[PDB]
Amino acid sequence: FPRIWLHNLGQHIYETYG
């Protein structure tokens, strides 16, 4: 599903932790 592209954004929140 093209949604797999939105899941990649989840990695962006990883930068906020550190």
Swiss-Prot record:
It is found in: Virion; Host nucleus; Host extracellular space. Phosphorylated on several residues by host. These phosphorylations regulate VPR activity for the nuclear import of the HIV-1 pre-integration complex. During virus replication, may deplete host UNG protein, and incude G2-M cell cycle arrest. Acts by targeting specific host proteins for degradation by the 26S proteasome, through association with the cellular CUL4A-DDB1 E3 ligase complex by direct interaction with host VPRPB/DCAF-1. Cell cycle arrest reportedly occurs within hours of infection and is not blocked by antiviral agents, suggesting that it is initiated by the VPR carried into the virion. Additionally, VPR induces apoptosis in a cell cycle dependent manner suggesting that these two effects are mechanistically linked. During virus entry, plays a role in the transport of the viral pre-integration (PIC) complex to the host nucleus. This function is crucial for viral infection of non-dividing macrophages. May act directly at the nuclear pore complex, by binding nucleoporins phenylalanine-glycine (FG)-repeat regions. Belongs to the HIV-1 VPR protein family. Homooligomer, may form homodimer. Interacts with p6-gag region of the Pr55 Gag precursor protein through a (Leu-X-X)4 motif near the C-terminus of the P6gag protein. Interacts with host UNG. May interact with host RAD23A/HHR23A. Interacts with host VPRBP/DCAF1, leading to hijack the CUL4A-RBX1-DDB1-DCAF1/VPRBP complex, mediating ubiquitination of host proteins such as TERT and ZGPAT and arrest of the cell cycle in G2 phase. HIV-1 lineages are divided in three main groups, M (for Major), O (for Outlier), and N (for New, or Non-M, Non-O). The vast majority of strains found worldwide belong to the group M. Group O seems to be endemic to and largely confined to Cameroon and neighboring countries in West Central Africa, where these viruses represent a small minority of HIV-1 strains. The group N is represented by a limited number of isolates from Cameroonian persons. The group M is further subdivided in 9 clades or subtypes (A to D, F to H, J and K). This is Protein Vpr. It comes from Human immunodeficiency virus type 1 group M subtype B (isolate NY5). The gene is vpr. The chain holds residues 34 to 51 of 96 of the full protein.
